[PDB]
Design a protein around this ligand. Structure first.
Ligand SMILES: [Zn+2]
Ligand SMILES: [Zn+2]
Ligand SMILES: [Zn+2]
Lengths: 89, 55, 196, 223, 129
RNA sequence: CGCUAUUAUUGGGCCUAAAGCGUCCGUAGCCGGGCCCGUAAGUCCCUGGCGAAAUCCCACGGCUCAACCGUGGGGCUUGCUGG
RNA sequence: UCCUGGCUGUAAAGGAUGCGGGCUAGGUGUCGGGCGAGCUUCGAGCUCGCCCGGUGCCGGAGGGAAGCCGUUAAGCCCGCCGCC
């Protein structure tokens, strides 16, 4: 077969020239003094990964699912995005 | 609020359906509701209290 | 027992149908003649006339509408209106009286009475669009579609139509308590018929 | 202020208009599930004042149509417009016109008169909240060759559908939805009507008392 | 020719629902049809079904209450494990707890909720919503 | 690769747009009415022995964080086999 | 072009619509069989109605890009073959 190369940790948009998206992202870039769109995109990607994990784990059965729920909540707490009495929704 | 229900069948009345409603002619105590499909297809109806059993 | 003797019913011919029929009217047919003509049952006519009397009396007179495109039913509608207060439209029913408020005689009633649901198919449609109950005089060849109360009777003959509308006006009055009881309705049935 | 401002200069022509001017009918939900005809846009201006703000009056399409009289050919405008409050009430209309202004105004008045009331909730396998941010179950609509299927989605998933549907659902008050389509979407009229009919058919599914609690179902305005 | 009577029963129920009937007659009866109707009654989708003895193979008389949108048989009767019900829920039903998959198990005919409670799988034979 | 439900099990079409053999008989195969008894091959549950490591997901720890590396928990190997 | 006995295997060989089964309003004609009522010039005759099976026209719900189809589906379900 083939070995795996290292892959990007950000995702680009599906259409490049949509006005609403351009305006939103222009505001964000200007206000948080970012150098490029790569940074915004990689933070967006972080958030999307958290969301996908929650969607997958929500209404699932087994021991590992419970363990991973608690891990996700602890990590968000430790990063400063949720409080302690936070639920998965 | 509440949503009404046909008397022949048991299905909710939709917003812009050509439905009708009236008072039972024999009794005078109930409200008969009729939906568009039951009207165009001539589905019979029966009052709950008396049972007058009309079209 | 009866609102008017069986002799009078059969003299008028309320019980005579046509050579056609329908499945919706199977409830109301009694017997087919040997010549192929269908005969109605007068007891169900009597019952439905009583019921319709009550129903109409439970309304307001100035919002009631009667119609008859057919020629042998214009004067009966006219007199039913004169007596009850109900509005009448004998001739044609210009399209738009119920759906277009830019016409001159535009009105929106709360109940509609139809003489024949096939000849009067325009007003039926408009009433369906505005959302009110429909009383109808139905014969064998008729369908019960978009009809909420149906009276079985011959809807062709002058004598029959006159008798039916006379009975119905008298019942409306009795049920509104404007006549202490029947026998106090001194209007002749001749006055409802169409002259020659 | 503007309530009476509009009420003063409106002379009714229908019984519903008269009741809405007097005050027998005071809420918007009282006109719907009865077979009333709605011939005046002032009824809706008065009961739903949110449908006069420019933010709630999307113009969806302008088309240029032609007729032959050569003879010389004659040019006309067709306009398709949507209106609605963002909490359960949307309508859609088409307008003929010789000028674009005429076409637009006619289309918006027909949209106000073609007003419906929808349901909302949460029925996705991935959120299971009890809040009305989506539709409660899956629905199907059609017009012409276009077939639309709308499916419930989870919070933060914003309107995975074409743009016409995006606008219509925004005006109806829906935030999250998945879509499947079939047919010719480039007919904007028929695509729009199909989405509209899908939203209408939320009221044709039969349910039970427990489904309301389970999905957080809401008929019209929330709270 | 006649190949599956359960499918016919359920299609007849759907069409009579669509046009607003009250009572429906199912001419070749079976014990699977009996059990499916039993599940449907327990879950409130019909009313008061009974069995009638012709000399051939009985008839089933069913009363309707305007609660069914769609009912159908599942062909082929796919085998399903206790951990693989959500795929089929998504494939056949419109929302997460809305309708019933009817499952045949070695312990009998039941819904996929009961089956999950017991931790068993089986075969798919019907959906109702 | 996706766009493409322009290969369609999920999930397409065949009067007039591409498309029902000129009509019939029948071989293999595929699909097959209702009840009772048995069997347990398919099917379902539970347990033992296998499916190398790397590569995939999660948390913690060590390089200024990170990429990377380590310690653990799962998954993957389309499945095989004893009860 | 007809007759006797053989070959060829083709057509707008068209309902331009493969075959079987179940369900989803009917009206009005006509052919064959049966039953029931009346008439009868007593006729294997005439008239009306109902059941089964064939063959047509119209049509509500519904379907379809529309023309149009609509219990003799071009609707919903269960199967098998052929073709794009
Ligand atoms: Zn109904
Ligand atoms: Zn009553
Ligand atoms: Zn949610």
């Amino acid at each position: 077969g083939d070995p795996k190369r290292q892959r990007k940790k950000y995702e680009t948009p599906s259409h490049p020239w949509i006005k609403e998206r351009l305006d939103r992202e222009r505001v964000l870039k200007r206000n948080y003094a970012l150098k490029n769109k790569k940074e915004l995109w990689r933070h967006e990607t972080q958030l999307k990964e958290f969301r996908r994990r929650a969607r997958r784990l929500l209404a699932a059965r087994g021991k590992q699912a419970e363990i991973e729920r608690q891990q996700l909540l602890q990590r968000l707490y430790r990063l400063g995005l949720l409080p302690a009495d936070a639920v998965l929704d | 609020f509440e949503v009404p229900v046909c008397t022949s069948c048991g299905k909710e009345i939709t917003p812009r359906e050509h439905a009708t409603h009236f008072v039972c002619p024999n009794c005078g105590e109930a409200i008969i509701w009729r939906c568009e499909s039951c009207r165009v297809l001539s589905v019979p109806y029966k009052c709950p209290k008396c049972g007058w059993e009309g079209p | 027992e009866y609102l008017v003797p069986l002799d009078q019913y059969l003299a008028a011919g309320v019980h005579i149908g046509t050579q056609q029929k329908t499945k919706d009217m199977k409830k109301f047919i009694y017997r087919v003649r040997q010549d192929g003509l269908y005969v109605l049952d007068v007891r169900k006519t009597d019952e439905r006339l009583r019921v319709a009397g009550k129903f109409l009396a439970k309304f307001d007179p100035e919002s009631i509408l009667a119609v008859s495109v057919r020629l042998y039913g214009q004067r009966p509608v006219k007199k039913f209106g004169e007596v009850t207060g109900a509005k009448a439209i004998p001739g044609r029913f210009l399209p738009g009286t119920m759906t277009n408020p830019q016409v001159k005689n535009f009105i929106e009633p709360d109940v509609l009475i139809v003489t024949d649901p096939r000849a009067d198919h325009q007003a039926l449609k408009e009433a369906v669009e505005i959302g009110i109950p429909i009383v109808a005089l139905v014969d064998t060849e008729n369908f019960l579609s978009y009809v909420d109360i149906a009276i079985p009777t011959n809807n062709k003959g002058r004598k029959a139509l006159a008798l039916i509308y006379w009975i119905l006006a008298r019942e409306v009055l009795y049920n509104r308590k404007e006549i202490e009881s029947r026998e106090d309705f001194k209007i002749p049935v001749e006055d409802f018929e169409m002259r020659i | 202020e503007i309530a009476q401002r509009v009420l003063e200069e409106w002379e009714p022509k229908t019984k519903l208009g008269r009741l809405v001017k007097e005050g027998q009918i005071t809420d918007i939900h009282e006109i719907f599930r009865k077979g009333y005809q709605i011939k005046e846009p002032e009824i809706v201006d008065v009961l739903l004042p949110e449908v006069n703000l420019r933010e709630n009056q999307e113009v969806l399409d302008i088309a240029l149509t032609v007729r032959m009289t050569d003879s010389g050919r004659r040019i006309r405008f067709r306009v398709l417009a949507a209106v609605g409050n963002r909490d359960g009430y949307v309508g859609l209309g088409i307008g003929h016109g010789r000028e674009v202004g005429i076409a637009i105004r006619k289309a918006i008045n027909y949209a106000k008169m073609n007003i419906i009331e929808i349901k909302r909730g949460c029925g996705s396998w991935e959120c299971r909240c009890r809040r009305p941010h989506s539709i409660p179950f899956a629905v199907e609509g059609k017009e012409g060759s276009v077939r639309v299927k709308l499916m419930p989605g989870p919070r933060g998933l914003g309107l995975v559908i074409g743009d016409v549907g995006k606008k219509i659902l925004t005006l109806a008050g829906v935030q999250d939805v998945w879509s499947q389509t079939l047919g010719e979407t480039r007919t904007t009229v028929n695509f729009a009507k199909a989405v509209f009919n899908a939203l209408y058919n939320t009221n044709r599914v039969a349910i039970k008392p427990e489904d309301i609690e389970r999905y957080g179902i809401v008929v019209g305005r929330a709270m | 020719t006649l190949l599956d009577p359960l499918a016919n029963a359920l299609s007849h129920i759907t069409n009579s629902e669509r046009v607003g009937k009250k009572e429906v007659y199912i001419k070749p009866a079976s014990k699977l049809i009996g059990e499916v109707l039993r599940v449907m009654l327990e879950n409130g989708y019909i009313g008061e079904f009974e069995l009638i003895d012709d000399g051939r193979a009985g008839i089933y008389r069913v009363q309707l209450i305007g609660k069914i949108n769609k009912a159908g048989a599942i062909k082929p009767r796919f085998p399903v494990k206790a951990r693989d019900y959500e795929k089929w829920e998504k494939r056949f039903l419109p929302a997460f707890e809305f309708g019933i998959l009817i499952v045949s198990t070695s312990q009998g005919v039941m819904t996929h909720k009961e089956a999950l409670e017991k931790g068993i799988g089986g075969r798919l034979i019907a959906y109702v919503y």
